[PDB]
Amino acid sequence: NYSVASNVMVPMRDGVRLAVDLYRPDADGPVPVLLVRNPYDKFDVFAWSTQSTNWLEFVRDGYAVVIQDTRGLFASEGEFVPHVDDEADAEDTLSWILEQAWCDGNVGMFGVSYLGVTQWQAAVSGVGGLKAIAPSMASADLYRAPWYGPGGALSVEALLGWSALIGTGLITSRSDARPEDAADFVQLAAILNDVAGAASVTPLAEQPLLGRLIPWVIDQVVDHPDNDESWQSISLFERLGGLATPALITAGWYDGFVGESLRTFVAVKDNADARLVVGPWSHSNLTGRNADRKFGIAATYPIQEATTMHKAFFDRHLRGETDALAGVPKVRLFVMGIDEWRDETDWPLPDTAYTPFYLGGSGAANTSTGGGTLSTSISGTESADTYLYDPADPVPSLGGTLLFHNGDNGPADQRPIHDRDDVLCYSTEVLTDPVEVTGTVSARLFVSSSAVDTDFTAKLVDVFPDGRAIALCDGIVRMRYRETLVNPTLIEAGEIYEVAIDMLATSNVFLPGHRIMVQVSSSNFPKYDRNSNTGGVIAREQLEEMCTAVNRIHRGPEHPSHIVLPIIKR
Numbered sequence: 001n002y003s004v005a006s007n008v009m010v011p012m013r014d015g016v017r018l019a020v021d022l023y024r025p026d027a028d029g030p031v032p033v034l035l036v037r038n039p040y041d042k043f044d045v046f047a048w049s050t051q052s053t054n055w056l057e058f059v060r061d062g063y064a065v066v067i068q069d070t071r072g073l074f075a076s077e078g079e080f081v082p083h084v085d086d087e088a089d090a091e092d093t094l095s096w097i098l099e100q101a102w103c104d105g106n107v108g109m110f111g112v113s114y115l116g117v118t119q120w121q122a123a124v125s126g127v128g129g130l131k132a133i134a135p136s137m138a139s140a141d142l143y144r145a146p147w148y149g150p151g152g153a154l155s156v157e158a159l160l161g162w163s164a165l166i167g168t169g170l171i172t173s174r175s176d177a178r179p180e181d182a183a184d185f186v187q188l189a190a191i192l193n194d195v196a197g198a199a200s201v202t203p204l205a206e207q208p209l210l211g212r213l214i215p216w217v218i219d220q221v222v223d224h225p226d227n228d229e230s231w232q233s234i235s236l237f238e239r240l241g242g243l244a245t246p247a248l249i250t251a252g253w254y255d256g257f258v259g260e261s262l263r264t265f266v267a268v269k270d271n272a273d274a275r276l277v278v279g280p281w282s283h284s285n286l287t288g289r290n291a292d293r294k295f296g297i298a299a300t301y302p303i304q305e306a307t308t309m310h311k312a313f314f315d316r317h318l319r320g321e322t323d324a325l326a327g328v329p330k331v332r333l334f335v336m337g338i339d340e341w342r343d344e345t346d347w348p349l350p351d352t353a354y355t356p357f358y359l360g361g362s363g364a365a366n367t368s369t370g371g372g373t374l375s376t377s378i379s380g381t382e383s384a385d386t387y388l389y390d391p392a393d394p395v396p397s398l399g400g401t402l403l404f405h406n407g408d409n410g411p412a413d414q415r416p417i418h419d420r421d422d423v424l425c426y427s428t429e430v431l432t433d434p435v436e437v438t439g440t441v442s443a444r445l446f447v448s449s450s451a452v453d454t455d456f457t458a459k460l461v462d463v464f465p466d467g468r469a470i471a472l473c474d475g476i477v478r479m480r481y482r483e484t485l486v487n488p489t490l491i492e493a494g495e496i497y498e499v500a501i502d503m504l505a506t507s508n509v510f511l512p513g514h515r516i517m518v519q520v521s522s523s524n525f526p527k528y529d530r531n532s533n534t535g536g537v538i539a540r541e542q543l544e545e546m547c548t549a550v551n552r553i554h555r556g557p558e559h560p561s562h563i564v565l566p567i568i569k570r
Ligand SMILES: *[B]([O])([O])C1=[C][C]=[C][C]=[C]1
Pocket: 112, 113, 114, 115, 146, 158, 162, 283, 403
């Protein structure tokens, strides 16, 4: 049995009061507490909970749960600006919880997405009472995920889509109903119905609606393309290695935060009890069912199993039950292809063979019907594949790690974009034996451009016997950020550069009858904004002042372009 207290006002260091809801068990004395920091209304528990845990079970089992409205939203006072106030607000909320009569000195956290990012922001405070966190589909470096990326390109669909979602929330919670609210609601809906079209406006920085409702969209995100001091100020990643806080980390292979979610596991595993669970989900699709790819009912987000695991995790760290995690694996991955859940002892997998698969083939590799090949052997002849990248006609984003723009079809069939001359395809011969690729994926390409800046993309694909070319993982490298995301430099026209493309991670068994395929291009819109091919401030440029670029991929003995695949042999 339990009770629920609504709108308990918690004072922050500056006097601003944040509203919390208290779910407290009918107990004799103090109990362990779990905190959730939410920017989408603490009252609306059903909206996020289905992507997390059946957490009322925690309350029925003796835990107190506190759900808070973040600063400036809904029942909370103050002004809302994403990320900047969460470290301090979390520290003050954790301190308040610890001071209460119903708290036994043990606090934990759980939640998904922004409710996951806020946990990393709470973890770096150094509050002794915080014994464990459980961040799902989260990031500890906001530049790397979800706003930009390891390649330095703006995740424009993520930005405009989320800003429009928050804009809808900021309006239905402010001081009195304004006459322009009705018109603004329709305009925000127009952005959510066509994020690609909203991202196609030039200059990208000119956002009349979003820039008015939430200035941060331009002031912080669009205006800061480099991983500068403004981003480092809200980044938690470098402080993660110094922590000794247990973390139950959940991720999804097609989730926009996957690269960063996995990196947080690697950062905390040595100093504390870190756990990892990765399924085949995208941010908005946790069903395991997609348009052209079904992973089976076992792939559907196992909410009750997740609840049991979280309870066992919290029982060990908040209650002191030393044997609570007995039989529970360190890492649990959904291996695609064979479509089965598998227990592992570590991430990256102990037996990982980082194997180069070289780009080769006779003739031009343009289109799926070209001569592009992939092999573990170095190509014998020096060749080059050339194409024209026009910002007015970018390669459309199809699946992958899309968040808001068609973000419910991660393992998308790539056939609709196969006819494009700007999509270079490289494939292995039809496999006779299974090849498992589980781990971080990257590419090393020898490239040249006619422009002083451009982008280069790489996408890993599983070609099915029936024709389906299913996307797995992808990445991008904006040339000015080839060596560093902090201090960019331009490239010289015609000169060959060896660049690295971070393609995040995947777990897939390429079964017999299938082919391993890699797509190389210079755009992936709106997953990433279009490079202007000018070397200018991309988001401030007009479409008419943008240039086309004649891009080239070099392959052979002296230029061994390849994709590094994390091969597991069992
Ligand atoms: B999550 O809360 O669903 C989220 C947060 C920031 C950007 C995209 C998604």
